[PDB]
Amino acid sequence: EVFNATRFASVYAWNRKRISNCVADYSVLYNSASFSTFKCYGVSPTKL
Amino acid sequence: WNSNNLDSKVGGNYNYLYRLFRKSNLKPFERDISTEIYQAGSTPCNGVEGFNCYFPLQSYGFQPTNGVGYQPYRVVVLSFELLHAPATVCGPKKSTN
């Protein structure tokens, strides 16, 4: 729902989401072949 | 040893780089002078860097106005092996008798 929703917020008051007591896989977020730009500083996108 | 006037330049330092992100680990007694771009999964660039490409050869930034932890340190490693040949300061010793 954070990615696919009916509408978003503005920049002066944006949505803040915390991921706690959960688990996910960042492998599906990389092979989507639908993103325009993808920058990931601080760590490698394939070794995080 | 620490160098305060040998490598400490005002306009930074770009002639010395260190590998940080490349996956190829340098084994001992080896050398690799290849300047490539780190590949992150898809889109292997290795010279046409862009989408999902990082610069592993990060710059140091040697400046004389920095702290003691950022000053350049000229490091020299001396490896060898034994039981093959002597040296000079070993000892002046020719055939005695």
UniProtKB/Swiss-Prot annotation, chain B:
Documented effect of changing S42N: In strain: 20A.EU2, Iota/B.1.526, Omicron/BA.1, Omicron/BA.2, Omicron/BA.2.12.1, Omicron/BA.2.75, Omicron/BA.4, Omicron/BA.5, Omicron/BQ.1.1, Omicron/XBB.1.5, Omicron/EG.5.1
Immunodominant HLA epitope recognized by the CD8+: annotated segments: 13-21
Effect of Q63R: In strain: Omicron/BA.1, Omicron/BA.2, Omicron/BA.2.12.1, Omicron/BA.2.75, Omicron/BA.4, Omicron/BA.5, Omicron/BQ.1.1, Omicron/XBB.1.5, Omicron/EG.5.1
Consequence when changing N66T: In strain: 19B/501T
Region feature Receptor-binding motif, mapped onto this chain: 2-73
Documented effect of changing N66Y: In strain: Alpha/B.1.1.7, Beta/B.1.351, Gamma/P.1, Theta/P.3, Mu/B.1.621, 19B/501Y, Omicron/BA.1, Omicron/BA.2, Omicron/BA.2.12.1, Omicron/BA.2.75, Omicron/BA.4, Omicron/BA.5, Omicron/BQ.1.1, Omicron/XBB.1.5, Omicron/EG.5.1; May enhance affinity to human ACE2 receptor
Outcome (variant: N5K): In strain: Omicron/BA.1, Omicron/BA.2, Omicron/BA.2.12.1, Omicron/BA.2.75, Omicron/BA.4, Omicron/BA.5, Omicron/BQ.1.1, Omicron/XBB.1.5, Omicron/EG.5.1
Superkingdom of this protein's organism: Viruses
Its job: Attaches the virion to the cell membrane by interacting with host receptor, initiating the infection. The major receptor is host ACE2. When S2/S2' has been cleaved, binding to the receptor triggers direct fusion at the cell membrane. When S2/S2' has not been cleaved, binding to the receptor results in internalization of the virus by endocytosis using host TFRC and GRM2 and leading to fusion of the virion membrane with the host endosomal membrane. Alternatively, may use NRP1/NRP2 and integrin as entry receptors.
Designated gene of the protein: S
Effect of F51V: In strain: Omicron/BA.4, Omicron/BA.5, Omicron/BQ.1.1
Effect upon mutating Y70H: In strain: Omicron/BA.1, Omicron/BA.2, Omicron/BA.2.12.1, Omicron/BA.2.75, Omicron/BA.4, Omicron/BA.5, Omicron/BQ.1.1, Omicron/XBB.1.5, Omicron/EG.5.1
Effect of F51P: In strain: Omicron/XBB.1.5, Omicron/EG.5.1
Full-length numbering of the shown residues: 436 to 532 of 1273
Outcome, altering E49A: In strain: Omicron/BA.1, Omicron/BA.2, Omicron/BA.2.12.1, Omicron/BA.2.75, Omicron/BA.4, Omicron/BA.5, Omicron/BQ.1.1, Omicron/XBB.1.5, Omicron/EG.5.1
Disulfide partners: C45-C53
Subunit-level organization: Binds to host ACE2. RBD also interacts with the N-linked glycan on 'Asn-90' of ACE2. Cleavage of S generates a polybasic C-terminal sequence on S1 that binds to host Neuropilin-1 (NRP1) and Neuropilin-2 (NRP2) receptors. Interacts with host integrin alpha-5/beta-1 (ITGA5:ITGB1) and with ACE2 in complex with integrin alpha-5/beta-1 (ITGA5:ITGB1). May interact via cytoplasmic c-terminus with M protein. May interact (via N-terminus) with host bilirubin and biliverdin, thereby preventing antibody binding to the SARS-CoV-2 spike NTD via an allosteric mechanism.
Protein name per the record: Spike protein S1
Segments of this protein annotated with the region Disordered: 20-55, 84-97
